[PDB]
Structures are given as C-alpha cells and as structure tokens.
C-alpha cells in the first residue's frame, strides 16, 4: 500500500509538565498563535492527546524530535 501518505504528530497528556509550559512550547516550536497553542494544550489535557501538526513522515519525525527535546510526550503516525 502506498507509503507516500500524510502523517501527524500527536502530543500525549503527561502528569508533570505545566499547562502554561505546553502552550509556550507549541508557540515556540511551531510559531502558533496563543489561541491556537492554548486550544491544542487544552485538547491534550482534556482528551488525553491531540494532533499538533501534520505533513510528510520525515517532517513529522522532526516535530517529534523537537517536542521530545522540550520534554513533551510526542509520537507520530500515518493519517488515514
Ligand atoms: Mg491536564
Ligand atoms: Mg506531554
Ligand atoms: Mg486523521
């Protein structure tokens, strides 16, 4: 099945990181506005996870690495 397909980066809720820290990380790493970053942060906190970015597999590998360096629990998967 064709592997040339889009992927997403997902951030998972963690019990240590501050909600204010998560909002800041999404702004700093992705350039998102505050309303956007806060909405994503709250989605992680209230649903347990959220898609935070989307693109090619190789581009999502970078976003995962960036988020891990910031201390956030990030994974990637194919978007169906
Ligand atoms: Mg929470
Ligand atoms: Mg996290
Ligand atoms: Mg999807």
TrEMBL record:
GO terms for molecular function: peptidase activity. The keyword Protease applies. Keywords: Hydrolase, Protease. Residues 4-74 form the Adaptor protein ClpS core domain. The keyword Protease applies. GO terms for biological process: protein catabolic process; proteolysis. Involved in the modulation of the specificity of the ClpAP-mediated ATP-dependent protein degradation. Binds to the N-terminal domain of the chaperone ClpA. Belongs to the ClpS family. This is ATP-dependent Clp protease adapter protein ClpS. The chain holds residues 21 to 100 of 100 of the full protein.
